[PDB]
CSV table of C-alpha atoms and ligand atoms in Angstrom, one decimal:
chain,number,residue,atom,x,y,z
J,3,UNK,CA,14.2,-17.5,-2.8
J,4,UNK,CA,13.5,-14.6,-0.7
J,5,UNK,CA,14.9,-12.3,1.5
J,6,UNK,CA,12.5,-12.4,4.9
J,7,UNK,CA,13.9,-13.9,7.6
J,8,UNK,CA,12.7,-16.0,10.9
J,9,UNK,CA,9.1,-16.3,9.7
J,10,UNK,CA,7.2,-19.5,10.8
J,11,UNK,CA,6.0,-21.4,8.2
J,12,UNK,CA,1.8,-21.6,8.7
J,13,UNK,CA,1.3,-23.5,4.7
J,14,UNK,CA,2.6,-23.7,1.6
J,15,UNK,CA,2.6,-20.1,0.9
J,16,UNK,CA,2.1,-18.3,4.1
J,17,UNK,CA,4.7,-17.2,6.6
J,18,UNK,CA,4.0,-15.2,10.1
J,19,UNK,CA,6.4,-13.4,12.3
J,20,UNK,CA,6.2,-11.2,15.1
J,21,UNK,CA,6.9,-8.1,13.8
J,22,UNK,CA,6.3,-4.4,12.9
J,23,UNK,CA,5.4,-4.3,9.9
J,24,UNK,CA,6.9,-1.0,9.0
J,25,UNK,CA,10.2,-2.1,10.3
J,26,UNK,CA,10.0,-5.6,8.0
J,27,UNK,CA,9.2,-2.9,5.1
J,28,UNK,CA,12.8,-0.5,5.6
J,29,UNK,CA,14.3,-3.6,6.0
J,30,UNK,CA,13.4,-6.0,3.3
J,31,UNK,CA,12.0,-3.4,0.5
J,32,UNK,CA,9.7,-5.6,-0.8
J,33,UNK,CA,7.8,-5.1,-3.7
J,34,UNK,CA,4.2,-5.2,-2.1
J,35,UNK,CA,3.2,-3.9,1.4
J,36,UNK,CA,-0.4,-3.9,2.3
J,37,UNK,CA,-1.7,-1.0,3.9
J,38,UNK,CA,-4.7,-1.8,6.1
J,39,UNK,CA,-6.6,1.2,5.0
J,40,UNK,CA,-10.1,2.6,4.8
J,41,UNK,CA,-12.2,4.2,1.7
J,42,UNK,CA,-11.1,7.6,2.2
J,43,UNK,CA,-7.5,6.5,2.5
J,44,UNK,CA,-6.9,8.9,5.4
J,45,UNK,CA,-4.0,7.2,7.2
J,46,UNK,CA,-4.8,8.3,10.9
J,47,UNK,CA,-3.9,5.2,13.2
J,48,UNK,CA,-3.0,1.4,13.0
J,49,UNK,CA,-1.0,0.4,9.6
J,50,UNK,CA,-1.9,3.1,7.8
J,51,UNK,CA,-1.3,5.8,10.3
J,52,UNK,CA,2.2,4.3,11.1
J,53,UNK,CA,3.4,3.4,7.6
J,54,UNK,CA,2.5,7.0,6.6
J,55,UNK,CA,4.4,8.7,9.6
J,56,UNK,CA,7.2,6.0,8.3
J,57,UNK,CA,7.2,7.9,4.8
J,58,UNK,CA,6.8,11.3,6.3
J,59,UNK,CA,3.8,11.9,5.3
J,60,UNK,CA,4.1,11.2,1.3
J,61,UNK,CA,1.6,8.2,1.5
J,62,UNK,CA,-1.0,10.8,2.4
J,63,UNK,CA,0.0,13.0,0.2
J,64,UNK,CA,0.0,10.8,-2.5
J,65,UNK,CA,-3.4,9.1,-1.4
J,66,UNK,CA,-5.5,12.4,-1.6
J,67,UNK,CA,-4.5,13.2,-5.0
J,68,UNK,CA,-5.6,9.8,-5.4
J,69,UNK,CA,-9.2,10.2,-3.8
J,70,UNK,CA,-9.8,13.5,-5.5
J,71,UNK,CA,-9.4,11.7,-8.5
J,72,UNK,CA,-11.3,8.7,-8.5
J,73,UNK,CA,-13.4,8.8,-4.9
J,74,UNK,CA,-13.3,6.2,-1.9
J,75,UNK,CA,-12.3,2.8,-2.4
J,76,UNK,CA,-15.1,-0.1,-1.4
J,77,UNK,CA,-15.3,-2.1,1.8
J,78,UNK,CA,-13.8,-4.7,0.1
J,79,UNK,CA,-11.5,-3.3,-2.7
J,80,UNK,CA,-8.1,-2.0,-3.1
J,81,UNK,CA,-6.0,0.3,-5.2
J,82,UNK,CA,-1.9,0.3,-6.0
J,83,UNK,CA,-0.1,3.1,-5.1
J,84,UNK,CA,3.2,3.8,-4.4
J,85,UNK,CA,5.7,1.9,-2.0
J,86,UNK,CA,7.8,5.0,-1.0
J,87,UNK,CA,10.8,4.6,1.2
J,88,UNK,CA,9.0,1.1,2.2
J,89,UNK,CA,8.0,-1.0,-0.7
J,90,UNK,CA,8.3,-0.7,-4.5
J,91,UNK,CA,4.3,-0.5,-4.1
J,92,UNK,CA,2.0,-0.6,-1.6
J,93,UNK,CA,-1.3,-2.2,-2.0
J,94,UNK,CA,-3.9,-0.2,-0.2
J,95,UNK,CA,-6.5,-2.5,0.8
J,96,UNK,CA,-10.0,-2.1,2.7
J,97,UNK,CA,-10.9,-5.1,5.1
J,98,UNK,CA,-14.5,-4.2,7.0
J,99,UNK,CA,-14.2,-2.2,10.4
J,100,UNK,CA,-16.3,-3.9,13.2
J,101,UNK,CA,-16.0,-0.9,15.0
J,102,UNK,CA,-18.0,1.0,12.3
J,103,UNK,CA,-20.7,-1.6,11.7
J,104,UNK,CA,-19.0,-3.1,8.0
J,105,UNK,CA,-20.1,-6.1,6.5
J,106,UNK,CA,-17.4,-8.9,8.4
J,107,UNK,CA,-18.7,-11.0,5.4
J,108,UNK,CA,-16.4,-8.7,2.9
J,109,UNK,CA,-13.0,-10.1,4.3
J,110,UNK,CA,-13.1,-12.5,2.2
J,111,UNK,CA,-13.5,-10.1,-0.8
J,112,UNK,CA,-10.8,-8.2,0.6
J,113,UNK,CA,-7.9,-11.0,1.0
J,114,UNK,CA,-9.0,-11.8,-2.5
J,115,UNK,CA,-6.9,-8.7,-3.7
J,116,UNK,CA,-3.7,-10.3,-2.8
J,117,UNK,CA,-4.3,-13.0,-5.2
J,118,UNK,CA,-3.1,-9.9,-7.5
J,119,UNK,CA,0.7,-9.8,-6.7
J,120,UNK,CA,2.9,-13.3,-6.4
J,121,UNK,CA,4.6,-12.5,-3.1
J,122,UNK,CA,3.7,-9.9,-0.3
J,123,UNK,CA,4.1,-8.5,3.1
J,124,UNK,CA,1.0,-7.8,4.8
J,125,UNK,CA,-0.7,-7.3,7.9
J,126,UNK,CA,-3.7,-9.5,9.2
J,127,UNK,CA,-6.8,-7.8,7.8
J,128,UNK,CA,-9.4,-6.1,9.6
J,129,UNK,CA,-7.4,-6.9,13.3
J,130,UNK,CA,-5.7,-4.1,15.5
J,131,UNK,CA,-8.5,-1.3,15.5
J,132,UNK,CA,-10.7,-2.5,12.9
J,133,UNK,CA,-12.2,-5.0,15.7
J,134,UNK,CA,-12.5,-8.1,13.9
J,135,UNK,CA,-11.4,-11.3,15.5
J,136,UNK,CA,-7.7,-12.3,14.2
J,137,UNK,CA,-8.1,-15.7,14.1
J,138,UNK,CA,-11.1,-15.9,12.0
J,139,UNK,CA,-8.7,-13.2,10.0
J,140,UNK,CA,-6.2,-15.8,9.8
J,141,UNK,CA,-8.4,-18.1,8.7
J,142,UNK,CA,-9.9,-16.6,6.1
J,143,UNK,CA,-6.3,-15.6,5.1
J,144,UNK,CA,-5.1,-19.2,4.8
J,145,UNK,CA,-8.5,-20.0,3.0
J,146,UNK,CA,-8.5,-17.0,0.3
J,147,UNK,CA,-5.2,-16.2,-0.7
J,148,UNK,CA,-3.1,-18.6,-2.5
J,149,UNK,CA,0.4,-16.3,-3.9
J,150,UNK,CA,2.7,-15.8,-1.0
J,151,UNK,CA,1.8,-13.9,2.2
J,152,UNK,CA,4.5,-12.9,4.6
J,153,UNK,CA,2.3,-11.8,7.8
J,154,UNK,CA,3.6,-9.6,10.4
J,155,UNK,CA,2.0,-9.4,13.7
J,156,UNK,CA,3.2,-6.5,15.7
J,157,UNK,CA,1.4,-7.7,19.4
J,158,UNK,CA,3.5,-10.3,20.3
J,159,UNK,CA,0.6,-11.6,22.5
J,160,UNK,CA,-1.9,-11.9,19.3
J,161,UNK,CA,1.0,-13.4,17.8
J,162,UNK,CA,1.8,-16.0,20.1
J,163,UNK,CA,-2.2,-16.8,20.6
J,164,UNK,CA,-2.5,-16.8,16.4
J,165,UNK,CA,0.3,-19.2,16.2
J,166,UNK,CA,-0.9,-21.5,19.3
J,167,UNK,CA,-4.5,-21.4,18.1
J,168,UNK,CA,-3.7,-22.1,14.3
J,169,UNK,CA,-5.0,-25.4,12.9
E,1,LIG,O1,-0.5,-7.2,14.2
E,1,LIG,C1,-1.2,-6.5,15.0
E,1,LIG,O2,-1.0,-6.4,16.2
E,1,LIG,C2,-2.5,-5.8,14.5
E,1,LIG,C3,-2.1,-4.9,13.3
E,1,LIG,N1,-1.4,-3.7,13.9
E,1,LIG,C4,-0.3,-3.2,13.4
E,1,LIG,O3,0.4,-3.7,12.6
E,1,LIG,C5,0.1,-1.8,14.0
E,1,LIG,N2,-0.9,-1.2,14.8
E,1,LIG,C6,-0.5,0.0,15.3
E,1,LIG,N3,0.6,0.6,15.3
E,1,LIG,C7,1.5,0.0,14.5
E,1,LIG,N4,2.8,0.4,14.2
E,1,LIG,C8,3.5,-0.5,13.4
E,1,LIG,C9,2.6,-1.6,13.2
E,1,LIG,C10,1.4,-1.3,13.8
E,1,LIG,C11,-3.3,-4.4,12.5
E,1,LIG,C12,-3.8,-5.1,11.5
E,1,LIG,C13,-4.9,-4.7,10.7
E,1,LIG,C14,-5.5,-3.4,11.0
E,1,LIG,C15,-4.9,-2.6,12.0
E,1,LIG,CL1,-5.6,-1.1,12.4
E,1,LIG,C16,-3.8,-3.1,12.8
């Protein structure tokens, strides 16, 4: 048992919910949040930008110390960092951008990270500005990951057409 509340059930191990994911993250403290990030790990917009202005700028801060180090992530990969204010961790992963031309075939590759941790809060990969289309995200989501996935959809339009859409 859990602490996330009024989350549909999709299968046996994923749950969805209308929701912003950075107000899930103050208010359950879980131990993973996904970050929908890119290689560089510059939080500008989306996820990223929002769960960074949510930890006042430490997840930047923390993430280019973290790129000096050891260079951009892969289209596709992921790295562990810290949770912050939000999370005990977050899980900083890289779905493909549509808008800049990535591989859509790497989504897969990229849920495949969650298979990592046994329970986490996440947002749908590669949706929002990345330009992919959320319900083949879902899909592959449902298909790839099999620990626990709590999903929170912040357009309550998407979410209504994910949920009335999902088979
Ligand atoms: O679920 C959705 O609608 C799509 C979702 N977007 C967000 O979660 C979101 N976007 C902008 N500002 C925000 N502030 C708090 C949350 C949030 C998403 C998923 C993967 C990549 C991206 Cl880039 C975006």
């Amino acid at each position: 048992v859990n602490s996330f509340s009024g989350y549909l059930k999709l299968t046996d191990n994923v749950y969805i919910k209308n929701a912003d994911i950075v107000e899930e993250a103050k208010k359950v403290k879980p131990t993973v949040v996904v970050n929908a990030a890119n290689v560089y790990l510059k939080h500008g917009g989306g996820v990223a930008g929002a769960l960074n202005k949510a930890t006042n700028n430490a997840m930047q801060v923390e993430s280019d110390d973290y790129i000096a180090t050891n260079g951009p992530l892969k289209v596709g990969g992921s790295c562990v960092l810290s949770g912050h204010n939000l999370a005990k961790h977050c899980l900083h992963v890289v779905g493909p951008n549509v808008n800049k031309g990535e591989d859509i075939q790497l989504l897969k590759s990229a849920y495949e990270n969650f298979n990592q941790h046994e329970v986490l809060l996440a947002p749908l990969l590669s949706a929002g500005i990345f330009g992919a289309d959320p319900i083949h995200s879902l899909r592959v989501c449902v298909d790839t990951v099999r620990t626990n996935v709590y999903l929170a959809v912040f357009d309550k339009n998407l979410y209504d057409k994910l949920v009335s859409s999902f088979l």
